[PDB]
Structures are given as C-alpha cells and as structure tokens.
Design a protein around this ligand. Structure first.
Ligand SMILES: CCC1=C(C)/C(=C/C2=NC(=C\c3[nH]c(/C=C4\NC(=O)[C@H](C)[C@H]4CC)c(C)c3CCC(=O)O)/C(CCC(=O)O)=C2C)NC1=O
Ligand SMILES: CCC1=C(C)/C(=C/C2=NC(=C\c3[nH]c(/C=C4\NC(=O)[C@H](C)[C@H]4CC)c(C)c3CCC(=O)O)/C(CCC(=O)O)=C2C)NC1=O
Ligand SMILES: CCC1=C(C)/C(=C/C2=NC(=C\c3[nH]c(/C=C4\NC(=O)[C@H](C)[C@H]4CC)c(C)c3CCC(=O)O)/C(CCC(=O)O)=C2C)NC1=O
Ligand SMILES: CCC1=C(C)/C(=C/C2=NC(=C\c3[nH]c(/C=C4\NC(=O)[C@H](C)[C@H]4CC)c(C)c3CCC(=O)O)/C(CCC(=O)O)=C2C)NC1=O
Ligand SMILES: CCC1=C(C)/C(=C/C2=NC(=C\c3[nH]c(/C=C4\NC(=O)[C@H](C)[C@H]4CC)c(C)c3CCC(=O)O)/C(CCC(=O)O)=C2C)NC1=O
Ligand SMILES: CCC1=C(C)/C(=C/C2=NC(=C\c3[nH]c(/C=C4\NC(=O)[C@H](C)[C@H]4CC)c(C)c3CCC(=O)O)/C(CCC(=O)O)=C2C)NC1=O
Ligand SMILES: CCC1=C(C)/C(=C/C2=NC(=C\c3[nH]c(/C=C4\NC(=O)[C@H](C)[C@H]4CC)c(C)c3CCC(=O)O)/C(CCC(=O)O)=C2C)NC1=O
Ligand SMILES: CCC1=C(C)/C(=C/C2=NC(=C\c3[nH]c(/C=C4\NC(=O)[C@H](C)[C@H]4CC)c(C)c3CCC(=O)O)/C(CCC(=O)O)=C2C)NC1=O
Ligand SMILES: CCC1=C(C)/C(=C/C2=NC(=C\c3[nH]c(/C=C4\NC(=O)[C@H](C)[C@H]4CC)c(C)c3CCC(=O)O)/C(CCC(=O)O)=C2C)NC1=O
Lengths: 172, 163, 51, 172, 162, 162, 172
C-alpha cells in the first residue's frame, strides 16, 4: 500500500535526493484536490449496493448463460460468491481512489486472481465485463451533484476509470 | 509500505473487511488540510539543507571535543564526510516525513535497524542527538507558525527514537 | 525481537473471502474445541486430532 | 544434522555392518583432538561481534556501492540485515566446526540461500566476499596462541577454512 | 541421529544463540568418555557371533514353547530372523556407545517398536531375555568403565522394550 | 610522450647503446610507483564530476566579478566552457598519473598554454584557483602515496599556469 | 615515442574520455609484470654480443655467397656494416620490449629500412633471415632460468617474438 506521497518519496530516495520544488508543487496540488477525492470516495462507498446490483442485473441480462443450470453463477452459493467478488473489487477500487495509486489494488486483490478463476472454472472475460459494468454504473453516482459543491472533477473520473479498467484487465 | 494516515485508514478498513466509513474519510481530510504547512516546512527545510548540515556537524564537534583527537572516530577527513552524509540523511528523511505527513519515512529508513547498526559500528547516538537538537534550534528560526510545530514534531520523534 | 519483518504481499485465497458457507458441510473440517476436553473419549479424539 | 560420529554410524548401518576397527580409530582420534576443537569453537563464539565488525568494515570499504542510496545495504534496516546474516552464517560455521561435519551448515543455513538472495535482489558475490572476510577475521582469532596451551591446530584451521569456503561457494 | 554434540547444537539453534560455556563443558565430558565407550564398542564388535548365538539360545531356553512347530520360533527362517534381530540390537547398542548417545537406538530400534511388535505379534519379552543375556555376558567381556557404558545402553534398550 | 620509460629509451637511443642498469633501475622505480599512481587516477576518475563542479564554484567564489554581465563568466556557454576546461585539466592529470610522467600535461595543456590564454583573454589565476580546489579535495579523496602523486601532478599544472 | 601507457592515453584522448576501469586494470597488470619485463630486457642486453655472433655465424654458414668476392658482406667494410645493423636492430627490439610498444622500432629502425636495403643492393630476404637467427638466439637466452627466480613469462616470450618478426616483416 503506497499512496502518491509515499511513491514520490520512494522514487526520491532511490535517487537519494530531496523532493524538488516542482514535485512538492504537484503533491500540494494533490492535497488541495483531496476534498474532491474524498467526495468521489464517498460517492462510491455510499452507493455501493446500488452499483453492485445494477452491474449484476446488466451482466445477467446480457449473459444469461451464467444463471441457467450448468452456468457458473447458478446456485445461491455461486451467485452470492459473484456478488461478494464484485463488492471486493469495488471496495479495493475505493481504496485505490482514496490513496491515489493502484498499489493496494495490485497487491491485496489482483495478485493471483486469474489463476483462481481458471481453477474454479469461472469465465474471466465475464468477470471483466462485470467490472466494466460496475465502472459504468459507478460513474453515474460519481457524476451526481446532489448535496455536493459543484465543480470540475474530470481528473477523478479518469482516475476511477483507470482503476476499474486496471482491475478488469488484470482479471481478464 | 509506509505507515501514513491514508495507509492506516485503508489497512484498518481492509482488516475489518469493510468500506471506508465516515470517520476514516474525516481523518483523511484532516491529513489533506495538514499537508499544506507540512509541504511549506519541507520546502523551507530542503532549501536551507546545506547550512543546516554544516551547522549540525560543527555543533556536534563543539559538544563532543573528544571525538576529534587522533585515535577517535571523528578524526579523519572521510569521517568528516560521513558526518555530513549521515546528518544529510536524517534531514532528508525528516523532509520526507513532513511531505508524507507521518513518521513512515523515519521509521522505515532510519529508526528501524538503528541500534544494531550503531552498536556494530560503535557510533554514539549522542552525536546525532546533538546534531538534531541543533537542527531543531535552527528550524525554530527558519520556520514560524504551524509549519514550525510540524517540523519540530518529526525532529523530536527522531531524537526520541535515537535515545 | 529485532528488525521488523518484510511485507506480507498477499494473494487471493479462499480463506481470505469466506463470508459464504463452504460448498459441502461434510467437507468442512471439524472445529474441535474446549467442550470436547471434558469427556474422556472426546479428549482422546481431540488428542488424536491434534497429533 | 550429523556429527562425524553419526555420519560414520549411518554409513556403517547402510552397509549393514558394525563399525570397522579403522573407523573406530578415526573416531577415537577425533575424540582425542576434541579439546583443541572446543578451543577453536570457543574462539569463534567469543569473538563473533569483532569478526562481524571487521568483515563489515572491510566489505563496505571495498564495495562502496552497497552503502549508497539505491544500494542493497542502504537504509538502516538493510544494513542491520546484512550484519544479521553475517552473524547467522558465523553461528552455523561454529556449529559445524564443533560437530566436525558440514551437514548442519548445508542443511540449516546454505541449502536455499542463493535463491533467497536472488529473490531479494541481493548481490550474492558480495555475500560470498563478506563470508571470506569473516573467514580472515576468524582465522586471526583462531590462531591466537595466547591464553591457550600451545599445540598443532593446523587441521582445525583447515576445517574452519573449508567450512567458510563451502559457505561462500554455496551462496555464490 | 542424536548424540551429546547434536543435542548441544539443536538446543543452541532452537534459541538462535552461539554455543556458550555449558554446551562446551558437555562436549568435553563427551570427548573424555569416548575412549572407554569406543573400547566397549570394539570389544562388543569382536564378540559378534558368540554373543548373538548365546542370546538366541537364552531366548530359546527361557521360552521353550516358541521352538515348537506351529509357533513363532519354529523353522529355520524364523530362527534366522531371530539371529538377525539380536544382531540388529547389538549393532545399534555399539552404535550408541560410539555416538555416546542413545540416538542410534532411539531412532532405529525404539521409534516404532510397539507398533511393529504388535503388528507382527512379536513379544518384547523375547528381546528382553536376549538383552539380559547380553548384559550378563558384557560383565565378563568388559571391565571398568567400558562395562558401565555398555550396561547403560543395554539397560536403556531393556527399559524401552518393557 | 615524455615519461620515465621514454626518457630511458631516448637516452639510450641517442647514445647509440643498450639499456643498462641505471636505466633499468629508473624503469623499476616507475613500475613500483605505478600502484599509488593508478589508484589516484581511478579515484580521481570516479569523482570527476564532483571535482569539476566544485572547481567551477570555487572559481566563481574567488572571482565574483566574472559572473557579472559583460565579463567572461556571464552566460551559460561561458560556464559550460568553464566546466569543459576543468574537465580537460583533470583528464590530463589522470593521464599523467597513469603514464608516470608529466608528458601528457606538457604535450596537451602546457605547450601553447600562454599564447592561447593571451589570445582569448583567459586569466591563468582562474585555473590556478580551480586546481587549488582540486588539490584540496584530493587531499580528502586520497591518502598516502596516492595523494602525493596526485599533488605532484596538480602542482606541476599549477606551476605551468603561473 | 610511445609505450603501452601512452598509447592507451592516446586513444582515450581521441575519444576525449577518461581511462576506463578495464584500461587501468590492464596498465596495472603491465606494471606488475614490469619486473619480468626488466629481466627479459636485461637478458637481451647482457647477452647481445653472443646473440649477434651466433646469428652471424649461422647466417654466413647458410649463405656463403654473402662472404665471397661480389657478395654483399664480402669486404671488411660491408661485414662491419652488416654486424652493425644486426646490433642496431637487436637494440631497438630491446627498446620495444622495455616499452611494451613497437612504436620506437617502427619510427626509428624500420622507418625506411626496406628502401634503404633495396637501394644498397642488400638482400632483404637475408636481412630478415638474420633477424630470425637473432630471434632464435634471443629466445635461447630469455628462457634461461639461471640467475632469475623461476616463473611464467610466456607473454614476454611471445611479445619479444612479435617484435623480432615485425622487424623481419618490415624488412622483407
Ligand atoms: C480479497 C481479494 C480476493 C478476491 C477478489 C477473491 C476472489 C475469489 N472468488 C472465488 C469464488 C467465486 N467467484 C465467483 C464470481 C464469478 N463467477 C461468476 O461468473 C461471476 C460473473 C463472477 C463474479 C463477477 C464465483 C461464482 C465463485 C465460486 C466458484 C465455485 O464455487 O466453484 C474464490 C475462491 C474461494 C471460494 O470458493 O469461495 C476467490 C479466491 N479472493 C480474494 O482473496
Ligand atoms: C465527511 C467526509 C468529508 C467529505 C465527504 C468531504 C468533501 C468536501 N468537499 C468540499 C468542497 C468540494 N467538493 C467538490 C467535489 C465535486 N466536484 C464535482 O462537482 C463532483 C459532483 C463532486 C466530486 C466528484 C468540489 C469541486 C468542491 C469545491 C472545491 C473547489 O474545487 O474549489 C468540502 C467543503 C465544502 C463544505 O464543507 O461545505 C467538503 C467538506 N470532506 C470531508 O471531510
Ligand atoms: C539511512 C540513513 C543511514 C545512516 C544514518 C547511516 C549511518 C552510518 N554511518 C556510517 C559511517 C560513519 N559515520 C560516522 C559519524 C560520526 N563521525 C564523527 O565525526 C561524528 C561525531 C559523527 C557524525 C556527526 C563515523 C565515525 C563513521 C565511520 C564508522 C566506522 O567506519 O567504523 C555507517 C557505516 C557505513 C560505511 O561507512 O561503510 C553507517 C551505516 N547509514 C545510513 O544508511
Ligand atoms: C539460516 C539461513 C538463512 C539466512 C542466512 C537467511 C538470510 C536472509 N536475509 C534476508 C534479507 C537481506 N539480506 C541482506 C544481506 C546482504 N545485503 C548486503 O549487501 C550484504 C552483501 C549481504 C550480507 C553480507 C540484506 C541487506 C537483506 C535485506 C533485504 C531487504 O530488506 O529488502 C532475509 C529475508 C528478509 C528479512 O526478513 O530480513 C533472509 C531470510 N535466511 C535463512 O533461512
Ligand atoms: C569449557 C570449554 C573448554 C576449553 C576452553 C578447553 C581448553 C583446553 N585446552 C587444552 C589443551 C590444548 N589447547 C589447544 C588449542 C590451541 N592450540 C593452538 O595454540 C591454537 C591457537 C589453539 C586452538 C585453535 C591445544 C593444541 C591443546 C593441547 C591438546 C593436547 O594436549 O592433546 C586443555 C587440556 C589441558 C592440557 O592438555 O594441558 C583444555 C581443557 N577445554 C574445554 O572443555
Ligand atoms: C531397526 C531394527 C529392526 C528390528 C529389531 C526388527 C525386528 C523384526 N523382525 C521381524 C520378523 C521376525 N522376527 C522374529 C524373531 C523371533 N524369532 C524367534 O522366534 C525369537 C523368539 C524371536 C527373536 C528373539 C520372527 C519369528 C519373525 C517373523 C514374524 C512373522 O513373519 O510373522 C520383522 C518383520 C519384517 C520381516 O518379515 O522380516 C521385524 C520388523 N526389524 C528391524 O528393521
Ligand atoms: C586541451 C586543453 C584545452 C584547454 C584547457 C582549453 C581552454 C579554452 N577554453 C576556451 C573557452 C573559455 N574558457 C573560459 C574560462 C572559464 N569561463 C570563465 O567563466 C571561468 C572563470 C573560467 C573557468 C576557470 C571562457 C570565459 C571561455 C570563452 C572564451 C571566449 O570564447 O572568448 C577556449 C577558447 C576556444 C573555445 O571556444 O572553446 C580555450 C582554448 N582548450 C583546450 O583545448
Ligand atoms: C676483405 C678481405 C677479408 C678478410 C681479410 C676477411 C677475414 C675473415 N675471416 C673470416 C673467417 C675466419 N678466418 C679465420 C682465420 C684463420 N683461421 C685459423 O686457421 C688462423 C689462426 C687464422 C688466420 C691466421 C678464422 C679463425 C675465422 C673464423 C670466423 C668464424 O668462425 O665465423 C671471416 C668471417 C667470415 C666467414 O665465416 O668466413 C672474416 C671476415 N674477410 C674478408 O672479406
Ligand atoms: C637493475 C635491473 C633490474 C632487474 C634485472 C630486475 C629484475 C627482478 N626480477 C625479479 C623477480 C622475477 N623475475 C622473473 C623473470 C624470470 N623468471 C623466469 O625465469 C623468466 C625466464 C624470466 C623472465 C624473462 C620472475 C618470474 C620473477 C618473480 C616475480 C614475479 O613473477 O612477479 C624481481 C623482484 C624480486 C625477486 O624476486 O628477486 C626483480 C626486481 N629489477 C631491476 O631493477
């Protein structure tokens, strides 16, 4: 787990040099927009059940083959596992968004997940499609302006899209 | 793997297997406010690093005359260079800790493994204690206000762990 | 003690995510506990299981 | 973990036979020279910090790139780990010197150390150099004629050198 | 196996410490005892066939029934296996003497003794009788400290069987 | 160039005779002096950039006016040429250390030094200041015979400038 | 004039760079071997009249036409010049051996020697033959172990041979 400050520091230390003026400017800019970052994190956190349910509905609407017998999301045992995995991935994306780096998403979640999915027989491109649906469903709540000071957050939207896409690519 | 505010938040959330509650976001926002004086102190400290390092070496010599005479650790041009290098290391990691708004850089780079290394090379902790106290005295002058306190916290933490 | 250990650098494993009951109950390992220690034959079974 | 006695016993058992008279003579000679062996192992044990400090001073005078930022022994944690590894290897060499057989050293110390260092990004050639420096520092202390009865300890010196060499070769 | 030196090294290694003075005094105690123990081992090796056959006949005398047909001791194969087993016991006792530790016995004979004897319906009493014969002949064959050491290891084997 | 072996061979060549004990002894002394000399050359090579930067800064410290506009130190190209010249001097000092003769300096730097300085209006005291800084620093980077070798060559260059 | 050190410095200057660590290592090895080099050069110098006489005897037994009236070593004067030239060439070969470089031999001795001998009517094949006989006698003396400490000096032998046969190649 490294946030942006910690990696800036690690990269400075490998070079064995102090942090430059421009780098400190960038870190101060990050800290300044941290309020927007926190609003994005809260938008993901509060709306998580809605995002998971919406993505699941869409995924089983397109790929019904999962929910028929013989599909890989058939019994309540496997459907609940699907929903659990989606919640895990969304949670780790929220962690990465708050931290500012995909380090946590790299190490704690996606370390060996494709191999596990292959052993279980799960379709990995289906899991990736589910994560993409989660991303599309979560951008809606991210862009919601209710009870929030209105402003620009396009960088945060791109960052969250990058984290979701990185999880999806790692799994697929 | 540093232990900072955001990292503590995420680690305690993951350990409990849950999303980030509002309190964790509260602590994160406190850190984000706090970063501004911390970056200011880091800037005003990295800018004046050379004066601090020279003054720290001279202050250690003044407080410890006996290290200089032959047959001691301080005698030697290379040992003078290693004086300056060590104090520069400590100052650099203090600035890192200011930037990171935690003790993570100090604990990870200086504090962990301090006592075994000092014992193995027979380096006296009191030398660095004196140098850091000098740096504290100076950063009293260089900085003012919230940034001064914020720098003093990390200098004090380094001194406490050197003890 | 001494130095701190390195990072754990986790990996995805079934135990890490076990909110849901396992597939087969009979394949769930027997969770032997203190109340097994009070009987005699139960205590022998507990000792055998520990070994 | 076998000493010379247990190694002889195991070979004799594999042959299915009692120990021959020549093997008993060799073991009797080993037991007779065990007093000098105990002196040597005591010399290694009672000078361990001095040996490690001397080896470290030589090694980091010779190889300055380690103690630089970006070197493998840069922060205090890695420097402490370096000294700790040197102490571990010296401890196992003293065990082997007492036992008279390097089975303990190979089994418990050197068996998988090269791949561990490769996994950690450690220059194994530098570790072998450190072990050789420890060998020199330990041979300075083993040959200390003062404080012990004078005698011929060439065989013990050669065994200690062989254990240090075998450690260095197995690491790098 | 397990000797004095290996006990020392294992105890030091389990606490991750160098060998201190206590361990070296134990090692010196071993090295000084080695001479009588190796002498006892040499004497016991010299007396292979006499001791083995005497032990087998002692077992036959104390248990005359076993030699009868339909029992364990009947037949040339079973008597050969008797001689082989007593030879094993004597060999491991000499190994223990040389090692100056009950490691050879404890690892080769004792560990798994009850399970194997129960599976093959072997009686520990046969081996106890044979070892008591070996113990008796040891007093004749050894004098001084060597006899004491050999009796110690044979006693350990007898206690293990019973 | 002009080094101990070359002087030996040239003297023998001009006298129309072989190499005798006097000349072989000179060559001997050169071959043993090579050790501190090569060590000094390696140390100076490893620290060339630090030495050059420090030398430029010492030059600017001792002659503050040169950095002022309208003067030889004003501008980036002039300071690039600063560092280039100091690097030249350092390179040829390391050459002379390896060659065990002043021939590299005499052939590459000193021969034509005064005319070139006079033509481009360069001041010899600038380079004396830089070489004094390098002398002070090699006092720290080096020790023993390595340091006296380096100082002899740096002082030859300084005396050439003055 | 050039020795090995000065050539190395010359290429380094042509690149405009310092001397690399490998080049410094080669020069350190040269200077370490310098005492053997001195022994080789002193063997050439001390035994020079013997070498020249042996080469002359062999050459004029092989080629009797050189010492008949009408030969090119017939009158005393031409014979003196012949022996003088052989001495000169051996002397420049000893120079090149000490310097580690064949530069002085080329620049001084073999600068225009083939055209000299062609204009004089001197058989350049016979001059090359004399250089080969001198090389053989020189190898006989340089391999001598009396009055030197025994050691491996094969590189010096091969280098001396290269100087000799380079002279003979330039002549013929
Ligand atoms: C903390 C980080 C972490 C993650 C993310 C993780 C994922 C994970 N999901 C698993 C099972 C599963 N995961 C799924 C979900 C997939 N299958 C369906 O097709 C869906 C489309 C899709 C979800 C998007 C299913 C159905 C199973 C059960 C497979 C089975 O029971 O055979 C398992 C195997 C353990 C078990 O049997 O329950 C792991 C390790 N593990 C971790 O330690
Ligand atoms: C309790 C935990 C906590 C939260 C949730 C938090 C967010 C937060 N965002 C704020 C302003 C803001 N928040 C946003 C974020 C918006 N930009 C776009 O419109 C999006 C709809 C949205 C995010 C994607 C922006 C742009 C500002 C104004 C700051 C600026 O850019 O000037 C403020 C200051 C305004 C006020 O308090 O009245 C807070 C406290 N801080 C906290 O300590
Ligand atoms: C991460 C940060 C870090 C620190 C702090 C650090 C301390 C440190 N200082 C060292 C050298 C040294 N440092 C000193 C410092 C003393 N000199 C005296 O004049 C003064 C009283 C005092 C300094 C003001 C000395 C004497 C040595 C040489 C010790 C020796 O070689 O025995 C060494 C041994 C490495 C070597 O020289 O090869 C370490 C590990 N190392 C690190 O990686
Ligand atoms: C009983 C046999 C055994 C040994 C000896 C052993 C050594 C060992 N060395 C380690 C790391 C290390 N080892 C070294 C030592 C090297 N670095 C320096 O350059 C030197 C050249 C050299 C020492 C002479 C260092 C610096 C580390 C730290 C790497 C890191 O912290 O990332 C680690 C794991 C990381 C840790 O928790 O510290 C082990 C387990 N393991 C074993 O099972
Ligand atoms: C409690 C631990 C312990 C120690 C410390 C110990 C030391 C010890 N060393 C002894 C003799 C000796 N000690 C040495 C060893 C020395 N020879 C060379 O000088 C070497 C520098 C050096 C060893 C490397 C030798 C060769 C002897 C003579 C052995 C003999 O007489 O057979 C003796 C017997 C006294 C004698 O023979 O007069 C003892 C008890 N014994 C122990 O049980
Ligand atoms: C580690 C050393 C070791 C021992 C000591 C040992 C004992 C031993 N003896 C055996 C056979 C046997 N051993 C005997 C010995 C009997 N013969 C006479 O009756 C006597 C009264 C008595 C001996 C005192 C007999 C009868 C058998 C045959 C058992 C059977 O096949 O049912 C067997 C079964 C394997 C086989 O079929 O040969 C074992 C394991 N095995 C070992 O590896
Ligand atoms: C092989 C050895 C060698 C040396 C040593 C050398 C010196 C040298 N430096 C020059 C440039 C220069 N060098 C300097 C001097 C530096 N700048 C000032 O600020 C400092 C005080 C000072 C540092 C000590 C300056 C000012 C120039 C530009 C001069 C001009 O073009 O008018 C020039 C003019 C030719 C050019 O444009 O490059 C020469 C000949 N040239 C060589 O071939
Ligand atoms: C221009 C006129 C001229 C003269 C005068 C001359 C003298 C002469 N005699 C020679 C042979 C020789 N000549 C002699 C002389 C005789 N041997 C003994 O029976 C006598 C004691 C002694 C004379 C009194 C000897 C000893 C050699 C041996 C040279 C050798 O072995 O290479 C040689 C060497 C060439 C060869 O191998 O044949 C010369 C140069 N050469 C000339 O071209
Ligand atoms: C005044 C002129 C002068 C001379 C002549 C001289 C020679 C010289 N030869 C030496 C040894 C040596 N000399 C030789 C060379 C010989 N070994 C083999 O037999 C080869 C046939 C032959 C080489 C042509 C060797 C191999 C050594 C041993 C030292 C080494 O190998 O590094 C030594 C080192 C000390 C010694 O071991 O005696 C010197 C100084 N030094 C001088 O200042």
């Amino acid at each position: 787990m490294n946030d942006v400050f910690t990696r800036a520091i690690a990269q400075a230390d490998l070079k064995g040099s102090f942090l430059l003026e421009s780098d400190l400017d960038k870190l101060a800019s990050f800290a300044k927009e941290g309020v927007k970052r926190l609003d994005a994190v809260a938008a993901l956190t509060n709306n998580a059940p809605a995002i998971i349910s919406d993505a699941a509905h869409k995924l089983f609407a397109e790929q019904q083959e999962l929910i028929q017998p013989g599909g890989n999301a058939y019994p309540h045992r496997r459907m609940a596992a699907c929903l659990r995995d989606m919640e895990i991935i969304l949670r780790y994306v929220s962690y990465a968004l708050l931290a500012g780096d995909a380090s946590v998403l790299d190490d704690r979640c996606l370390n060996g997940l494709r191999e596990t999915y292959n052993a279980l027989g799960t379709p990995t491109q289906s899991v990736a499609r589910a994560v993409q649906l989660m991303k599309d469903a979560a951008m809606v709540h991210l862009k919601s302006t209710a009870n929030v000071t209105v402003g620009d957050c396009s960088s945060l939207y791109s960052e969250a899209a990058t984290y979701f896409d990185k999880a999806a690519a790692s799994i697929a | 793997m540093s232990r900072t505010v955001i990292t503590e938040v995420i680690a305690t959330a993951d350990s409990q297997g849950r999303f980030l509650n509002s309190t964790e976001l509260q602590a994160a926002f406190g850190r984000f406010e706090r970063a501004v004086p911390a970056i200011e102190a880091a800037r005003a400290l990295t800018k004046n690093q050379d004066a601090l390092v020279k003054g720290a070496v001279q202050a250690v010599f003044k407080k410890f005359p006996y290290v200089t005479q032959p047959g001691e650790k301080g005698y030697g041009d290379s040992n003078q260079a290693k004086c300056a290098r060590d104090i520069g290391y400590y100052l650099r990691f203090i600035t890192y800790s200011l930037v990171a708004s935690g003790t993570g850089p100090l604990d990870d780079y200086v504090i962990a493994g301090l006592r075994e290394v000092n014992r193995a090379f027979n380096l006296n902790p009191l030398w660095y204690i004196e140098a850091l106290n000098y740096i504290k005295g100076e950063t009293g002058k260089l900085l003012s206000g919230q940034s001064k306190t914020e720098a003093l916290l990390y200098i004090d933490h380094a001194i406490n762990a050197l003890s | 003690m001494g130095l701190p250990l390195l990072d754990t650098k986790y990996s995805s494993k079934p135990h890490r995510v076990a909110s849901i009951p396992a597939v087969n109950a009979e394949d769930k390992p027997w969770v032997l506990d203190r109340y097994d220690l009070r009987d005699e034959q139960g205590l022998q079974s507990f000792i055998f299981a520990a070994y």
